[PDB]
Structure 1
Amino acid sequence: ICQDVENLQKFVKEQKQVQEEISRMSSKAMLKVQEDIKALKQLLSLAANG
């Protein structure tokens, strides 16, 4: 049994690591995009009006 808790907390925690891992990983790259396509669309309107 107390082999036992040595492992389970270990597999659980191993998992929290991945949770951290995703947490480390987070977006600005994404936020960037809407701004750009919103911007490119506008230049296209230029060229078109030109």
Structure 2
Amino acid sequence: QVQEEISRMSSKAMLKVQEDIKALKQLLSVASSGLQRNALAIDKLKIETA
């Protein structure tokens, strides 16, 4: 009976997590590129103001 219960516990979320994480890595990378670009805008505007 416990054997069948373990068979019934069959897992699908653990499949969803890895996808979520692989997506969140790219999300952090998108924010990273965005801050990288805004940094140079900051540098140029600071140059003009100076």
What range is the shorter-chain TM-score in? 0.5 to 0.7
Q: CA RMSD in A?
A: 0.5
- What residue is the counterpart of 1:11 in the other structure? none
- State the one-letter code of the partner of 1:18: V
- What residue is the counterpart of 1:27 in the other structure? 11
Q: Which runs of 5+ in 1 are unaligned?
A: 1-16
C-alpha displacement at 1:42, in angstroms? 0.3
TM superposition score normalised by structure 1: 0.65
Q: Which runs of 5+ in 2 are unaligned?
A: 35-50
- What residue is the counterpart of 1:38 in the other structure? 22
- What residue is the counterpart of 1:12 in the other structure? none
